Amino acid sequence: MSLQPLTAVNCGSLVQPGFSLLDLEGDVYLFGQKGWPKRSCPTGIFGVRIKKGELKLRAISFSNNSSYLPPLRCPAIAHFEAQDGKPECYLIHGGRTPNNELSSSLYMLSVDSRGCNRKVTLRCEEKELVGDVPSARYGHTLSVINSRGKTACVLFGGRSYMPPTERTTQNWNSVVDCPPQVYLIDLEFGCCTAHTLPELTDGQSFHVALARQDCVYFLGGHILSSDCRPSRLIRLHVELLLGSPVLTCTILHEGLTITSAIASPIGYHEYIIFGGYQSETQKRMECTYVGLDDVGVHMESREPPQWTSEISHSRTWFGGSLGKGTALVAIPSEGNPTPPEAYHFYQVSFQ
Amino acid sequence: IMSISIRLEGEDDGITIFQEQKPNSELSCRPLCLMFVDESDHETLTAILGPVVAERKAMMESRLIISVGGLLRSFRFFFRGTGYDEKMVREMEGLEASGSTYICTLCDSTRAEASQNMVLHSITRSHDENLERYEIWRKNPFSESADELRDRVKGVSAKPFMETQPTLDALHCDIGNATEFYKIFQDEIGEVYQKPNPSREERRRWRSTLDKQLRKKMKLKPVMRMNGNYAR
Amino acid sequence: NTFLSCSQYHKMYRTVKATSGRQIFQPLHTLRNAEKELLPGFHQFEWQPALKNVSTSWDVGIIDGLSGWTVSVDDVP
Numbered sequence: 001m002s003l004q005p006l007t008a009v010n011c012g013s014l015v016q017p018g019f020s021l022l023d024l025e026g027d028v029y030l031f032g033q034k035g036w037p038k039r040s041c042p043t044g045i046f047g048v049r050i051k052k053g054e055l056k057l058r059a060i061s062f063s064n065n066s067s068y069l070p071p072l073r074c075p076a077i078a079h080f081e082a083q084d085g086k087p088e089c090y091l092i093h094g095g096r097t098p099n100n101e102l103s104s105s106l107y108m109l110s111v112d113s114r115g116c117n118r119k120v121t122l123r124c125e126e127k128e129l130v131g132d133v134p135s136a137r138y139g140h141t142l143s144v145i146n147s148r149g150k151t152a153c154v155l156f157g158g159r160s161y162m163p164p165t166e167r168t169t170q171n172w173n174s175v176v177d178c179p180p181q182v183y184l185i186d187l188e189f190g191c192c193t194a195h196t197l198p199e200l201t202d203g204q205s206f207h208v209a210l211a212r213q214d215c216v217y218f219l220g221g222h223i224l225s226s227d228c229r230p231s232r233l234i235r236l237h238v239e240l241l242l243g244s245p246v247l248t249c250t251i252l253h254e255g256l257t258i259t260s261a262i263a264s265p266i267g268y269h270e271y272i273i274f275g276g277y278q279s280e281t282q283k284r285m286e287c288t289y290v291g292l293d294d295v296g297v298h299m300e301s302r303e304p305p306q307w308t309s310e311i312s313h314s315r316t317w318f319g320g321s322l323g324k325g326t327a328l329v330a331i332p333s334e335g336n337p338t339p340p341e342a343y344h345f346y347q348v349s350f351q
Numbered sequence: 352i353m354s355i356s357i358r359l360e361g362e363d364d365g366i367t368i369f370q371e372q373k374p375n376s377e378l379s380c381r382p383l384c385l386m387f388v389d390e391s392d393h394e395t396l397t398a399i400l401g402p403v404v405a406e407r408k409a410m411m412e413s414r415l416i417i418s419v420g421g422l423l424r425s426f427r428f429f430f431r432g433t434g435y436d437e438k439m440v441r442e443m444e445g446l447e448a449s450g451s452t453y454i455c456t457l458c459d460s461t462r463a464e465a466s467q468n469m470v471l472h473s474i475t476r477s478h479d480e481n482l483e484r485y486e487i488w489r490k491n492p493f494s495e496s497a498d499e500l501r502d503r504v505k506g507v508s509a510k511p512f513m514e515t516q517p518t519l520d521a522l523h524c525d526i527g528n529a530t531e532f533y534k535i536f537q538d539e540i541g542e543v544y545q546k547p548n549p550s551r552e553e554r555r556r557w558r559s560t561l562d563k564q565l566r567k568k569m570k571l572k573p574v575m576r577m578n579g580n581y582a583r
Numbered sequence: 584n585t586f587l588s589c590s591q592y593h594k595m596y597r598t599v600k601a602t603s604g605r606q607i608f609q610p611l612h613t614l615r616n617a618e619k620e621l622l623p624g625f626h627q628f629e630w631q632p633a634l635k636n637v638s639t640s641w642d643v644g645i646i647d648g649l650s651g652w653t654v655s656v657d658d659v660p
């Protein structure tokens with residue numbers, strides 16, 4: 001467990017507070033960018049490199065057949081594992097554009113080719129959703145399950161804007177939790193089903209969801225309706241037997257008061273939970289370890305590295321996981337005149 | 352409020368009743384919203400200015416009914432977004448800025464194609480085609496490479512969020528031609544068409560004799576930046 | 584039209600009133616009551632057909648622009 005300051009050499013004004021790290025095929029890819037794609041990168045995506053503390057950003061390049069993507073803010077990132085047919089996939093859906101709007105489309109991102117000179121090329125295939133599509137929402141979660149043995153994807157949670165009847169120029173910027181119904185989407189074709197469950201009284205937002213062996217455990221769950229941060233941990237167990245996807249659930253006693261967490265995979269299934277926040281005011285500082293197996297998730301607190309006075313005294317803080325028990329975090333920065341690089345960086349490490 | 356004209360009862364057109372005598376004045380410019388925000392972050396600007404766009408778009412259809420002159424009466428509206436600068440005009444329309452290859456907001460000629468042919472052109476740009484061409488850029492139905500997807504849409508990258516009349520701004524045009532003639536005068540004092548590659552030293556040096564010449568003749572001290580009256 | 588502070592105006596009001604008045608200017612609280620005719624949110628109207636996703640109250644004055652932002656810290660602030 002350790003934290004180290006990193007200095008972003010240059011081009012750090014394009015990182016915004018909500019953004020994503022997709023770790024696939026060696027290098028990790030920054031996604032989500034401040035503003036629209038400057039012709040410095042008409043794509044929008046970056047390869048990130050950490051070297052002697054330096055945070056260096058390179059501009060990725062799409063393939064010819066790929067459709068291009070506008071930068072979602074807080075979408076649901078889903079790692080689709082490497083197998084037939086085209087390994088390996090990232091399911092990105094849905095976020096909010098750099099223009100404050102919600103994008104209810106489904107994008108699939110993969111790796112294509114390298115180098116020549118180490119360069120790595122990506123490609124995005126937009127995937128049609130027939131349905132029963134879920135409405136554009138943000139803060140939700142998407143997860144991949146393998147059930148005897150077909151792979152499917154489960155979509156649940158997240159806020160959205162007021163319905164377009166009550167959408168009011170006085171309630172525009174207000175969000176209300178979209179209703180809590182689980183969407184089962186096939187990777188191919190685009191057939192999306194909607195299920196409802198009784199135990200799910202209300203939808204959530206910002207609750208990290210985990211999936212293994214076609215079962216999903218949901219932590220946190222800041223509900224803005226009752227303003228609670230429920231520490232109950234939820235479980236659902238689904239099985240796809242053609243043609244209905246029968247789905248069941250259970251509530252568990254204990255989960256955790258965390259919203260917006262940074263979950264880094266380290267082992268096969270051992271995770272370190274970095275956490276965003278315990279309370280409205282008071283951010284989360286302790287680090288926890290979350291293993292999970294066929295029994296269930298097994299919880300353990302880890303010694304958090306000693307935070308600098310700066311990072312202990314931050315009003316807000318966010319970040320993400322470079323993966324494999326190492327994570328990257330950013331802090332709003334105050335200065336006069338404004339630096340302007342607003343955000344400071346730590347490299348956190350497990351063991 | 353630019354003009355008010357009349358339509359009832361038919362056959363004819365709009366009969367103007369009122370046309371603003373001094374539209375360029377400040378005293379006739381009505382503020383609606385103030386923010387402590389920068390123009391740059393698109394995120395915060397659209398978050399705030401969204402409800403406004405929906406109202407404009409939602410007001411275009413209906414008819415107003417107001418007690419005026421003693422009677423309830425009905426109005427219709429035509430909005431003309433023209434008071435934007437080009438930085439924001441191009442920002443607000445998905446276009447790339449500002450030394451881009453596609454220079455013109457109205458026509459499709461590149462920089463090269465704008466030094467070759469100066470005059471023969473036709474107005475093309477508007478809102479809706481920009482929307483559809485953004486579609487062409489996002490869906491990518493023809494599986495084209497970046498530079499050529501760039502070429503099929505002719506500079507349409509980001510999604511327009513707002514409609515602005517495709518119009519030119521007067522005042523900044525005067526400033527641009529004035530900075531160009533100022534830069535040209537700096538070059539001509541010295542020999543630029545004799546020596547095609549000067550350094551910065553002669554540029555500041557040429558600027559110094561111009562400024563001295565401007566003060567002795569016409570009585571105008573230099574400005575860090577040429578405001579409109581100095582351009583007059 | 585002169586950037587006159589409320590208190591600057593009252594000093595002048597006392598000044599011109601006490602001396603030879605026959606006050607001419609009006610007090611502040613009648614300026615403050617005779618203005619609501621000039622600012623927005625006072626006259627009635629009706630849009631035919633009904634405006635899209637706009638409330639029907641015709642008396643809204645100055646509203647704050649966040650427009651019902653869901654202030655919770657964890658989201659965009």
Ligand SMILES: [Zn+2]
Nearest residue numbers: 455457458459
């Ligand atoms: Zn043109």
